[PDB]
Design a protein around this ligand. Structure first.
Ligand code: HEM
Ligand code: HEM
Ligand SMILES: O=[N+]([O-])c1cccc2c(Br)n[nH]c12
Ligand SMILES: O=[N+]([O-])c1cccc2c(Br)n[nH]c12
Ligand SMILES: O=[N+]([O-])c1cccc2c(Br)n[nH]c12
Ligand SMILES: O=[N+]([O-])c1cccc2c(Br)n[nH]c12
Ligand SMILES: [Zn+2]
Lengths: 414, 416
């Protein structure tokens, strides 16, 4: 049952014993591996057409409360026993329960630590957790979100944070942020199918306009937020521009790069995932860290279905875009990534390159092997999208599995 | 909807369902509880040499399935000829414990093993494999001749041709034919007294075995190894490939004049020789196969892996890059130029080579061909996406289903 895990660069072997604590199934079976699939249809987080089975809920809740008491080393303490009894009395009478703020803080940090696709987990213990479960309206949601962005941005010296809105409840609508990130650029279907802006955001852009936003016409128009309180239409909120830190892109030696008029925002803030702690589900719990430079330079600017800028930059570079074998894509991608690093560095905004980040992730794997006997990791997401085998994680076998607390995908609210 | 894995392409937003995986009758290393997809050698395909034949029923089940695939492929399933072949195979197993393939069956089988290889990006070529039948081989000397003829056919003065040479199958009460080398052409790895390795560090063990068996070692960075060839129940015998049969390409760069001075080179012919070819339960323990290179394999993996030639820093220093900080992207810049020199050099030498952009575009066509032909394609995303510029290629954006279909190429334990 326990996997032998090899590092092919160093020749070292470890055994993952943490995976036996996984209680939830992924999509692979012995007859076929589906590890490269991006989204589930089983791992998701089905609405509440009535509360979960109480035996299922209290099973997850007791395991979480046990995780917490172990975490502060007061396992078996009277507090531990008294807490377990409170949670059980609550689920027996009401079909649900509530977490103490200290439990919430531990849970959100553990969800990050457990996220198999995140290469930045060496930071997992340094997470600012904002409790927003005292929130009864979309306008209040907006205030908490602005305060999050202000904290996390910190004038360019970014700090990881999460804001947790009230949990799901059976027979009642969810709190939701419709946006997939707190800061994203509009995507406008221009006449002829083609898109101005970020093609990934055409649908959310359209929803914003249909909910009364007056659209811009630029390539980098920051989107308004669509926030929804239970069983209400989402409400539109424009972020105050002074809250949204952006970095114009320039290259340290190619004069013309700046003329491309590229920019990116500083704060990566994922806002449409579900945070699951002890069987409780937080449908609105936006979290933010800082960027790995390849995410901007390679995926967001160079993906064919995104800004797709490779050929423009290659032409500016005078490269031979006529045959694959000139490696024009590869050369242009490196300079684009270099421009991102130089530019963030120049602006004094937190950024980490993919070599530094994967070196730290290897340190994190070693830390975790000692602390818990393993670390769930999804190779396809941990290895960067350029220069894969040039980083140490490529040569490291990994084991993927789901531990709780967890961040999960959930259906779009529309 | 369909009770099969749903597969998405995120660049194009298209969906397919893989029904082919329902034919898999050999399990992988994953469970609903945890994915082991990134492990390089799962103990599954792998084969711990069974002292004697297969269980008659196990072997018969695999043989029947294979013969059924064969008659389906020529469109005669359920036919008189098909029934008779199943009877003959059953009778031969009952009387001898094993059976033998017709020539056309071996050819079908060998092509199907390549088509079925989930880690191979070059599978659009699968129908154009040249199958050399060497099942009459009876000595190590004869194995060497067969291998020299393969190498000459396959290399073809630089216009490479895919080929496989199949030596006699494993048999009850008899040792195996084995090629000890992992490729027909490999460079030596020599352990230094100070602990470094000169040459290819991946090949220290095979290099020391060649020496232990009588080879007189060189001490260069790119010394072609001799072959250690083993006929049933004999010690391996050593053969030196005549140099004129081993085509090599000295590496230069199109604009960086100093690159040629580094004295780097690579061989033209990638020819895997230590895998097991399995067809209908029969095991061809010696069945070397060869194609042509994808340039990243040479330029990125063989020259720049930290546990291989590890040349990145040296080239980066020559390019005057800042190797003392990660954010200069010195590794990335050097890697791009090493891969460009590999493509340029092979192109200049008129030696077949394919860049990773062209290879992955053709693999996307292969996937579309196979969706129609078989309802899916087993594919191992971590091996199909190239080791540089991964998301710059179409395959990155394609979700993949990985599973084991037979006929198959499998790992097998080293002969020593
Ligand atoms: C501190 C710096 C951080 C860096 C540099 C970083 C980097 C990454 C990268 C490169 C990805 C793979 C790409 C993706 O899935 O979108 C990722 C994914 C992820 N990260 Fe991190 N991360 C950081 C902070 C955070 C924080 C603070 C959390 C949570 C509290 C977090 C949770 C996750 C999750 C859940 C994913 C999976 C996203 C998905 O499935 O779409 N990360 N991270
Ligand atoms: C025509 C050109 C070909 C190209 C460009 C090519 C390219 C590749 C690449 C890049 C790999 C991944 C690296 C690896 O797994 O070692 C690979 C793997 C493989 N190829 Fe191909 N291939 C070609 C022909 C062949 C042929 C002729 C066969 C067999 C008849 C073959 C069978 C396989 C197998 C079995 C693997 C997996 C090796 C392993 O797991 O160690 N390929 N190929
Ligand atoms: O840097 N990233 O590439 C990246 C990707 C996805 C999520 C996050 C967060 Br939250 N911080 N950085 C992230
Ligand atoms: O070494 N690894 O751990 C590992 C995992 C997945 C793919 C590859 C390839 Br291709 N070489 N090494 C790999
Ligand atoms: O090009 N390649 O990278 C490559 C890798 C592994 C096996 C083969 C064969 Br056989 N032809 N090319 C191959
Ligand atoms: O698109 N994909 O099929 C796919 C598979 C595996 C990982 C990734 C990432 Br990271 N982006 N897209 C991916
Ligand atoms: Zn898997």
């Amino acid at each position: 049952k326990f996997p032998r895990v090899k590092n092919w660069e160093l020749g070292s072997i470890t055994y993952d014993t943490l995976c036996a604590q996984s209680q939830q199934d992924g999509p692979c079976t012995p007859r076929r591996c589906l590890g490269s699939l991006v989204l589930p249809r089983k791992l998701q987080t089905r609405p509440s057409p009535g509360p979960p089975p109480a035996e299922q809920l209290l099973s997850q809740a007791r395991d979480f409360i046990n995780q917490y008491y172990s975490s502060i080393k007061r396992s078996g303490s009277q507090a531990h026993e008294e807490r377990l009894q409170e949670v059980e009395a609550e689920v027996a009478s009401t079909g649900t329960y509530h977490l103490r703020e200290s439990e919430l803080v531990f849970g959100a940090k553990q969800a990050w630590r457990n996220a198999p696709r995140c290469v930045g987990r060496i930071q997992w213990g340094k997470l600012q957790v904002f409790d927003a479960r005292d929130c009864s309206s979309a306008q209040e949601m907006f205030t908490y979100i602005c305060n999050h962005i202000k904290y996390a941005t910190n004038r360019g010296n970014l700090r990881s944070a999460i804001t947790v809105f009230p949990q799901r409840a059976p027979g009642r609508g969810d709190f939701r942020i419709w946006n997939s990130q707190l800061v994203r650029y509009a995507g406008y279907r221009q006449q002829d199918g083609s898109v101005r802006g970020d093609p990934a955001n055409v649908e959310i852009t359209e929803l914003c306009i249909q909910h009364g936003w007056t659209p811009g016409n630029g390539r980098f128009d920051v989107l308004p937020l669509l926030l929804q309180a239970p069983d209400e239409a989402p409400e539109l909120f424009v972020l105050p521009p002074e809250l949204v830190l952006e970095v114009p892109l320039e290259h340290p030696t190619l004069e013309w790069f700046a003329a491309l008029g590229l920019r990116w925002y500083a704060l990566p803030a994922v806002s449409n995932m579900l945070l699951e702690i002890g069987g409780l589900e937080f449908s609105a719990a936006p979290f933010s860290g800082w960027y790995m430079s390849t995410e901007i330079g390679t995926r967001n600017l160079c993906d064919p279905h995104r800004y797709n800028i490779l050929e423009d930059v290659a032409v500016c570079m005078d490269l031979d875009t006529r045959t694959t074998s000139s490696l024009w894509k590869d050369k242009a991608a490196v300079e684009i990534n270099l421009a991102v690093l130089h530019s963030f560095q120049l602006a004094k905004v937190t950024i980490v390159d993919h070599h530094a980040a994967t070196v730290s992730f290897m340190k994190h794997l070693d830390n975790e092997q000692k602390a818990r006997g393993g670390c769930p990791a999804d190779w396809a997401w941990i290895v960067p999208p350029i220069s894969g085998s040039l980083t140490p994680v490529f040569h490291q076998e990994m084991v993927n599995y789901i531990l709780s607390p967890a961040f999960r995908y959930q259906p779009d609210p529309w």
